[PDB]
Amino acid sequence: DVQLQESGGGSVQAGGSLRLSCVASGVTSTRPCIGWFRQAKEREGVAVVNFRGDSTYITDSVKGRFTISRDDTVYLQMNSLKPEDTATYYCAADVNRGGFCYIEDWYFSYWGQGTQVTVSSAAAHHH
């Protein structure tokens, strides 16, 4: 199996930033498309990146604040965070599309355990 190791979650204030990472191991043939998904509600897409670094985002609003990049190690840089960005973030892999990507979860067969991201309003935030 492809194995996915997530890191970089935490608790921040609204307007803050976090950088998630996902490291894929167990890749023996096709390098995977790596995607980030989140679930606060149903699971939803965020962004995906193909084996050569080309990215696709769920919406323009998301693309304006988050950036996905690839070194099989992928980063999701999250800026200008909204309270509503609070969720468990999951990385996922698709090795059945030649290394290329779709944004939808039904193309992904390997899932990380999830990493919690908590974004608090100014009134609620404590270090």
Residue numbers in the entry: 1 to 40, 43 to 52, 52A, 53 to 72, 76 to 82, 82A, 82B, 82C, ...
What do the authors report?
VHHs correspond to the antigen-binding domain of heavy-chain only antibodies (hcAbs) that, besides conventional IgGs, occur in all members of the Camelidae. Notably, VHHs are characterized by long CDR3 loops (average of 17 amino acids (aa) in contrast to human HCDR3 with on average 12–13 aa in length), which is often a feature of bnAbs against HIV-1 and may allow penetration through the highly glycosylated surface of Env into conserved epitopes not accessible to conventional antibodies. Based on these favorable features of nanobodies, we aimed at selecting broadly neutralizing nanobodies against HIV-1 from dromedaries immunized with soluble trimeric gp140 SOSIP immunogens. Overall, we could select Env-specific nanobodies from 25 families, of which six nanobodies showed potent neutralization of primary heterologous Tier 2 HIV-1 strains from several subtypes in a standardized pseudovirus-based in vitro neutralization assay.
Crystal structures were determined so far for VHH-5 (2.3 Å resolution) and VHH-28 (1.15 Å resolution); for A6 no crystal structure is available yet. Both, VHH-5 and VHH-28, have a long CDR3 region that folds over to partially mask the face of the VH domain that would be involved in contacts with the VL domain in a typical Fab fragment. The CDR3 of VHH-28 (19 residues long; H93-H102) is two amino acids shorter than that of VHH-5 (21 residues). In both structures, CDR3 is tethered to the body of the VHH by a disulfide bond between residue H33, and H100C or H100B, in VHH-5 or VHH-28, respectively. CDR2 (H50-H58) is 9 residues long in VHH-5, and 10 residues long in VHH-28; however, the H52A insertion in VHH-28 is accommodated by a bulge in the loop around residues H60-H62, so that the CDR2’s are the same length at their tip, and both adopt the canonical structure H2–9A, with residues 52–55 forming a type-I β-turn in VHH-5, and 52, 52A, 53, 54 forming the same turn in VHH-28. Interestingly, both nanobodies are derived from the phage library 54A2 at timepoint t2 after the late second immunization boost with optC SOSIP. For two of the broadest neutralizing VHHs, VHH-9 and VHH-28, binding to optC SOSIPs by ELISA correlated with potent neutralizing activity of the optC pseudovirus (IC50 0.03–0.04 µg/ml). VHH-9 and VHH-28 bound very well to optC SOSIP, but only weakly to ZM197M, which would explain why there is competition with CD4bs mAbs on the first, but not on the latter. Evidently, the neutralization patterns of VHH-28 and VHH-A6 show some degree of complementarity, as they cover all but two HIV-1 strains in the panel, including the epidemiologically most relevant subtypes C, A and B. 3D reconstructions of ZM197M-VHH A6, 5, and 28, each resolved at ~25 Å, were used to dock in a high resolution model of BG505 SOSIP.664-PGV04 complex, which confirmed the presence of extra density at the CD4bs.
